[PDB]
Paper text:
Old Yellow Enzymes ([name], EC 1.6.99.1) are a class of flavin-dependent ene-reductases (ERs) catalyzing the asymmetric hydrogenation of electronically activated C=C bonds in the presence of nicotinamide cofactors. We have identified and produced four new putative ERs from the filamentous fungi [name] CBS 513.88 and Botryotinia fuckeliana B05.10. Based on the most recent classification, AnOYE2 and BfOYE1 belong to Class II [name], as they share all the fingerprint motifs described for “classical” OYE homologues identified in fungi. On the other hand, [name] and BfOYE4 share most of the typical conserved residues reported in Class III [name] (S23, P24, C26, A60, Q102, R215, S249, Q265, G284, M285, F305, G307, R308, and R312; YqjM numbering).
[name] was solved and refined in the C121 space group with four molecules per asymmetric unit. The overall structure of a single subunit showed the typical conserved α8/β8-TIM barrel fold. In agreement with the general behavior of Class III [name], the four molecules within the asymmetric unit assembled into dimers with the functional quaternary architecture peculiar of these enzymes. [name] is an elongated dimer composed of two protomers with an interacting surface of 2807 Å2 (data obtained by EMBL-EBI-PISA analysis). Both the α1-helix and loop 3 (capping subdomain), as well as the peculiar long N-terminal and C-terminal loops of each protomer, were involved in the dimerization surface, which contained 71 interfacing residues that established 18 hydrogen bonds and 8 salt bridges. The C-terminus of each subunit (from Gly393 to Lys416) protruded through an “amino acid finger” (Trp397) that reached the active site of the adjacent subunit, shaping the entrance and the catalytic cavity of each subunit. [name] accommodated a non-covalently bound FMN cofactor molecule lying at the bottom of the active site pocket. Similar to other Class III [name], [name] contained the highly conserved proton donor Tyr220 and the histidine pair (His215 and His218) involved in the binding and proper orientation of the substrate through hydrogen bonding with the electron-withdrawing group of the substrate. The omit electronic density map revealed the presence of a small organic molecule, most likely SO4 anion, present within the crystallization precipitant agents, lying on top of the isoalloxazine ring of FMN. In the complex with SO4, two oxygens of the compound formed two hydrogen bonds with the side chain of His215 and Tyr220, thus confirming the importance of these residues in substrate orientation and catalysis.
Author numbering:
A (entry chain C): 2 to 401, 405 to 416, 422
B (entry chain B): 3 to 276, 282 to 401, 405 to 417
């Protein structure tokens, strides 16, 4: 009668509200069929996710001095528009020299909050949840952007690199094309920990709903863990007991600065894909042990189980759900003390729901699949015959009345 | 020791895209010949990298004709995936010509920077984006399509103008639709004047082309449709009497735009009332190939009259354009739109039926990677932005192996 087009609430600008957020499955379900676990909500701390299909964090090598531009709104905003359970922002440097590339996002200054907040604000206008993977590239810092012919090389001070400011647990390079790391002094660690706390606060200011700690891909914290990159003879190296000291502090510190209401995640690498060797390697057993130590600690809410990037001589056997067995191995070890999410060439909805139902995991992350298909939530929903919400701008053409839910039978691939 | 170059001509930094997305490989690795779909088209001096384009789609997400951060996230991602051309939704030349109070507008000058920020991004990517200027005529002051009061009038309460609705006559669309006032000749004058001004600010926004909305029962269409255009004036009566305002706006648009700016015209080819029909359409279409002001005709259908009975279907309105192409030949280019959900149907529509451009609407809403998807349908290698293709590589080619990440 006089139904009005209501504005999304809390946003510096107008856009139509979405009353059911996109990616929310129909709870009654016209089919009468039950909603599969992939499209079942998850409440972690004071935060609920309409589904369990997340966008894994993905560096776009498109910021300037760590500042997001319009680009990232067009990038992330189109994906947030189509209803992913959660969006993770790319590795965001805590210190300038912890950037991977010179084009990385960073959050070591307050000028980098607004660029990110503008995107987090678009996600929020659509009713989505969005967060930030805090990172430090350790001995893999000051490299080249990876679509460049110079890819896999050192970023010189002429490209904006810092070849003489790469820091890590010890002074051993990752590769021969990679830079020479400088053993981090206690002054270094101290400031890194201060810088992590500083960056997390700016993230909450930007409007992140959760924080993920990047302790993976041989970047740092991960390098502290792997014995062959950390030959320190102090309390931060030596035993496995010691090599975890710093990761466990950052976990504690992140939880401290966000409080009790903000989910905290941790990404780790489960194996270094190093073939039979008699020396100490980062194998699944090590990962599960670290994961166990984290559940003892109580800080983290979820472990994000990736692999690789740890050692230059890896031999990763990529394939569909190839690193799903790692995350299973971790959930059997921690059970319901922590949640785990998996990632890695998860390409259809069946595999996704199965890794959550049969194999008993909590959250499925996709990366490349969203880059090629920003509507994967709709695609996966179609794989499992699930009716899911899509925003009004997008659904009304794929209709027949006034439900916020799309029939999985329409525009079937 | 290479450098990552910024894009050119843009406010902000963004990695530059040497080979635009949607650009096939001139020497296709497979040796297979580039299908027409992925063959470039040049209108005036403008060159499109493929014949797959984003059809104009309204988003009912604007405030005072102003675009927001939404349209950047909406068209942005779609554009990043290399659509040959991207058309901005119907931009109203007059406030009362808006379909809804949430339509994008170009009747003032504060409505340019909004529309230009998105064009700027498209340009940063190497893509060609244009704008469809329009007037809703008797179908204006209506509600958004996803709202329960869909197919109804927007009162001043919602921000509508149920009284300032101006069309070719007081003939309303339906009991649900608003009551329109027949426009005075001074009204038509003001309208034509508004169009020129709107096109002018569009060129200031960065438009690479302009499409005329002469379809869907809006003013220009309402004038060509006898059941709504009976003014007894030089505009009312003879088919020629009704074709004037349309043909005038065509020339006027060609006049305001230069000779290097392509100008398209979208028309409805039937009212599905079987009365405007493929015949009336082919006639008006030839009148356009005569005037020589329009470079491309966007053949569509529907919206002309309530009580219409559209028969939707894969390529349901392709025949309409094949007929227009028949009576126009190389005199004008023709574009088809309508449930084209795969590349094979699209390419065929181009090669086996001679048509020039394939336009997709909803396919892009569901899949802003449609071009990538149509590419795999025809085993075509296309460029994708360096930010997207690097992970899908086994390494320096801007093109993606259509075999990687296939359904
Ligand atoms: C382009 C690109 C950027 C990425 N950026 C990050 C990142 O910033 N932080 C991180 O932990 N992983 C990053 N990843 C790793 C992926 O997020 C994730 O582990 C996933 O495996 C990548 O591909 P997938 O869809 O097959 O799972 C990135 C991957 C790609 C392809
Ligand atoms: C959400 C939406 C918005 C649209 N906006 C416009 C428009 O602004 N101008 C126009 O001429 N047609 C518009 N259309 C019609 C389409 O652009 C076009 O006629 C056709 O539907 C696209 O073909 P396809 O959707 O079957 O791929 C719109 C259609 C939809 C679903």
């Amino acid at each position: 009668k006089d139904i009005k087009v209501e504005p999304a609430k809390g946003i510096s600008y107008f856009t139509p509200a979405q009353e059911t957020p996109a990616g929310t499955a129909a709870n009654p379900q016209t089919s009468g069929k039950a909603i599969p676990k992939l499209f079942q909500p998850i409440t972690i701390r004071g935060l609920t996710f309409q589904n369990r299909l997340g966008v894994s964090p993905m560096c776009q090598y498109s910021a300037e001095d760590g500042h997001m531009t319009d680009y990232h709104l067009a990038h992330l905003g189109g994906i947030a528009q189509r209803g992913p359970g959660l969006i993770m922002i790319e590795a965001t440097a805590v210190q300038p020299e912890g950037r991977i590339s010179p084009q990385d996002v960073g959050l070591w200054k307050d000028s980098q909050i607004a660029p990110i907040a503008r995107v987090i604000e678009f996600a929020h206008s659509q009713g989505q949840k969005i967060g930030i993977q805090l990172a430090h590239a350790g001995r893999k810092a000051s490299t080249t952007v990876p679509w460049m012919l110079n890819h896999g090389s050192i970023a010189t001070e002429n490209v904006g690199g810092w070849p003489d400011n790469v820091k890590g647990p010890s002074d051993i390079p990752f590769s021969e094309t990679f830079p020479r790391p400088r053993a981090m002094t206690q002054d270094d660690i101290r400031e890194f920990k201060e810088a992590w706390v500083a960056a997390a606060k700016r993230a909450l200011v930007a409007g992140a709903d959760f924080i993920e700690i990047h302790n993976a891909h041989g970047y740092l914290l991960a390098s502290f863990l792997t014995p062959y990159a950390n030959k320190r003879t102090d309390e931060y190296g030596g035993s496995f007991e010691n090599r975890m000291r710093l990761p466990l502090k950052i976990a504690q510190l992140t939880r401290d600065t966000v409080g009790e209401h903000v989910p905290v995640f941790l990404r780790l690498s489960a194996s270094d894909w190093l073939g039979s060797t008699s020396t100490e390697t980062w194998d699944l057993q090590h990962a599960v042990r670290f994961a166990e130590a984290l559940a003892d600690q109580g800080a983290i809410d979820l472990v994000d189980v990736s692999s690789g990037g740890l050692h230059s001589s890896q031999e990763v056997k990529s394939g569909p759900g190839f690193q799903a067995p790692f995350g299973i191995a971790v959930k059997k070890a921690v059970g319901e003390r922590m949640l785990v999410a998996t990632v890695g060439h998860i390409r259809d909805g069946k595999l996704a729901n199965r890794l959550l139902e049969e194999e008993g995991l909590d959250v499925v992350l996709v990366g490349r699949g969203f880059q090629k298909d920003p509507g994967l939530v709709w695609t996966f929903a179609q794989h499992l015959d699930v009716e899911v919400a899509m925003p009004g701008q997008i659904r009304w053409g794929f209709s027949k009345r006034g439900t916020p839910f799309v029939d999985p039978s329409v525009y079937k691939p």
